[PDB]
Amino acid sequence: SVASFVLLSMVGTAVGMCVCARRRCITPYELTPGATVPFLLSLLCCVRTTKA
Amino acid sequence: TVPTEGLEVTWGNNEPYKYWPQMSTNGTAHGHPHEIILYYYELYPTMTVVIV
Amino acid sequence: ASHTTLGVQDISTTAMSWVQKITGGVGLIVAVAALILIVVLCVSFSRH
Numbered sequence: 001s002v003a004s005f006v007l008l009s010m011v012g013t014a015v016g017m018c019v020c021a022r023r024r025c026i027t028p029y030e031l032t033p034g035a036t037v038p039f040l041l042s043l044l045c046c047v048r049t050t051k052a
Numbered sequence: 053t054v055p056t057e058g059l060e061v062t063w064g065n066n067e068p069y070k071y072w073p074q075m076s077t078n079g080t081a082h083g084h085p086h087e088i089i090l091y092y093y094e095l096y097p098t099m100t101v102v103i104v
Numbered sequence: 105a106s107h108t109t110l111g112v113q114d115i116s117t118t119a120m121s122w123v124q125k126i127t128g129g130v131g132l133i134v135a136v137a138a139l140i141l142i143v144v145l146c147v148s149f150s151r152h
Contacts, residue, residue, distance in 0.1 A: 088119055095110065100112075
């Protein structure tokens with residue numbers, strides 16, 4: 001049971017790294033004045049990529 | 053006509069004759085043409101050519 | 105001779121090799137053409 005526990009904490013840390021990665025998708029491109037980065041979003045494609 | 057489950061015929065006072073079919077004299081063995089389908093009639097006539 | 109009973113999934117020397125020949129799909133590579141279509145479409149197709 002604690003092995004299932006530690007594996008689900010490994011999935012929890014996967015969730016934590018993914019949510020930190022989505023927050024560090026957002027912090028370079030909040031909605032910069034330029035509001036157009038194909039060179040960012042055309043390579044990253046993490047989440048909600050469609051805003052230029 | 054003998055089916056795949058055999059046949060029984062009796063005549064007179066003598067013993068009932070059983071009979072059983074077989075995997076025929078000619079078919080089409082392992083050959084360079086298509087040469088299975090005649091064989092694939094010998095087992096299973098009227099069916100499994102339907103999945104062909 | 106019931107002991108030589110036969111099911112369906114049965115083996116010739118050559119039948120399944122001709123199946124292996126006739127499983128030569130092309131739908132994979134035309135799906136690859138559909139993928140190159142959707143990624144050229146990614147010019148303005150980046151959310152759906």
